[PDB]
């Protein structure tokens, strides 16, 4: 066939899209215990019975958790069993033979879902498919219980029957590269921006201030963010797996936590710094020197290191459940599993405390600005909008994640992994958003223009 380019029309990818891959035992929309790629264990409400059937199917004590290999094997077994189920049946086979490969895959999909007998139950629909009346069968299949229980999937299967093409599944592959280029743009923006900032502060002598000494730290954290964390994360998501080993996996995770913590805590330090610089400038200039500021930076990076490399490299962050053990054992797995202790501690240190301090400090500024030696002009509005951006961007980017990060560790399976990763990346873009917020000074402007010779 000479076909080796992405997305070949078949039943396996279609079912992968319609079902999804979940290694731990879950409940479908109906309520039956399902595992892997749409593999029905049992109709019994008891989880122990499901574990029994699973252990019998696999051939070992799985504790409700199977590996990728076993999941794929079960998937293929169920597909082949569905096909043989079609061929054995007297109502399914005459229809199956009189279908193109695509519609054949649609039928195999239906049988894979609701079983041989169930699909054979569809007398009128199969009769219509047999006489090649695709649209009538499309209308008819939408009047079943199957369309009411799982409408999103039923629509795709029905559309596949009607059109005879992979239109309902072809669009799904576009979003992959579609978001890949977005990730690329993110990396480019972060790296370029932060490198520009660091270069600006390091090269020019007029940008050698304490505030800028903190900005340097923030830009460094965001730089290592855009160089190590974000690209490897993008590769991890796009390629579906991890090809660097457990050591580099946990090392990458360590870099992640370290950089995020250092970034946010540096934001906090900047907030406090500006508070003292604005409220009591004469004391701020005398007390806070460059050495003391560098000591502050060192302390922040130390605290960030204690909440990143220390617990992770020592495997203190590790969970105890079976899936976590399997992923830690698997060299190609780099999924993130933690206990309540590390999740809560890291969330409090990295985000929540700096959040509280920043809110309190900026509120102190906004409140103390109203009690100076002074008509509701435009300057106060502009300043309020400025701080609105400063706190607004940070909150909008990092709050939804650390909330989710604290909930997904309390009640199990309330937040889907997609949302977790997504919000984590919405946290990631803040690293790129920072150089646009903390570098708007005239000196920074002149530096930025002179650097690239605009």
């Amino acid at each position, epitope marked *: 066939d000479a076909e080796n380019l992405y997305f070949q029309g078949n039943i396996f990818e279609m079912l992968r899209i319609d079902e999804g891959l979940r290694l731990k035992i879950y409940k479908d929309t109906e309520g039956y215990y399902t595992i892997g790629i749409g593999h029905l264990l049992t109709k019994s409400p008891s989880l122990n019975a499901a574990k029994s059937e699973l252990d019998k199917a696999i051939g070992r004590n799985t504790n409700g958790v199977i590996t990728k290999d076993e999941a794929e094997k079960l998937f293929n077994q169920d597909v082949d069993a569905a096909v043989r189920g079609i061929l054995r049946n007297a109502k399914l086979k005459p229809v199956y033979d009189s279908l193109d490969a695509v519609r054949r895959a649609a039928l195999i999909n239906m049988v894979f879902q609701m079983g041989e007998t169930g699909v054979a139950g569809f007398t009128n629909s199969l009769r219509m498919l047999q006489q090649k009346r695709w649209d009538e069968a499309a209308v008819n299949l939408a009047k079943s219980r199957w369309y009411n229980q799982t409408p999103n999937r039923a629509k795709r299967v029905i559309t596949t029957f009607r059109t005879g093409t992979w239109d309902a599944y072809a669009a799904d592959e576009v979003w992959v590269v579609g978001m890949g280029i977005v990730m690329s743009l993110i990396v480019l923006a972060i790296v370029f921006g932060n490198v520009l900032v660091i270069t600006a502060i390091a090269k020019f002598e007029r940008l050698q201030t304490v505030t800028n000494y903190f900005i340097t730290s923030l830009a460094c954290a965001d730089l290592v963010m855009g160089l190590a964390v974000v690209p490897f994360g993008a590769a991890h998501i796009l390629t579906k797996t991890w090809t660097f080993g457990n050591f580099w996996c946990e090392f990458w995770t360590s870099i992640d936590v370290l950089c995020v913590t250092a970034s946010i805590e540096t934001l906090c330090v900047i907030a406090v710094d500006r508070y003292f610089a*604005i409220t009591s400038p004469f004391k701020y200039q005398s007390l806070l020197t460059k050495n003391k500021a560098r000591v502050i930076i060192l302390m922040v990076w130390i605290v960030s290191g204690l909440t990143s490399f220390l617990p992770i490299q020592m495997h203190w962050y590790r969970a105890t459940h079976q899936e976590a053990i399997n992923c830690y054992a698997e060299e190609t797995c780099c999924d993130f599993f933690t206990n309540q202790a590390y999740a809560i501690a890291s969330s409090i240190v990295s985000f929540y405390v700096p959040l509280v301090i920043m809110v309190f400090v900026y509120s102190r500024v906004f409140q103390e600005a109203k009690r100076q030696l002074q008509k509701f002009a435009l300057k106060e509005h502009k300043a309020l909008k*400025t701080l609105g951006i400063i706190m607004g961007t940070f909150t909008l980017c990092w709050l939804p994640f650390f909330i989710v990060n604290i909930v997904h560790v309390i009640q199990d399976n309330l937040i889907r992994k997609e949302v977790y990763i997504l919000l984590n990346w919405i946290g990631y873009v803040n690293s790129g958003f920072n150089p646009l917020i903390y570098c708007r*000074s005239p*000196d920074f402007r002149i530096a930025f223009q002179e650097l690239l010779c605009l």
Partner: nanobody
Amino acid sequence: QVQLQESGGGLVQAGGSLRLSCAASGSIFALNIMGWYRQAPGKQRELVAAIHSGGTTNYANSVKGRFTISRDNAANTVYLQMNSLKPEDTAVYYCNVKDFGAIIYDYDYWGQGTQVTVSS
């Protein structure tokens, strides 16, 4: 887009007193540092005397005890009291406003500059 009106400078004998004054015409953020700098003949621009919007002040080590800065009620006008002048106080005095409108940094507003000559 604000203006700074300086007034008070001029010729003065050694040991005499002089009063500088800077009026800020325009909208300035409530948190600011309004002060005076100077340029001596052949020397860099040095800070003379700055006052914070919160009342607190700050002076150079060569003018402390001789110079004293204050400000008006809400007119945003700053008055610099210069007593016991010296020949090394002969310089070009600039009025200045440090505005913390963007919080992260500070916008500087400068004056036209006034000449002060002390008769040696």
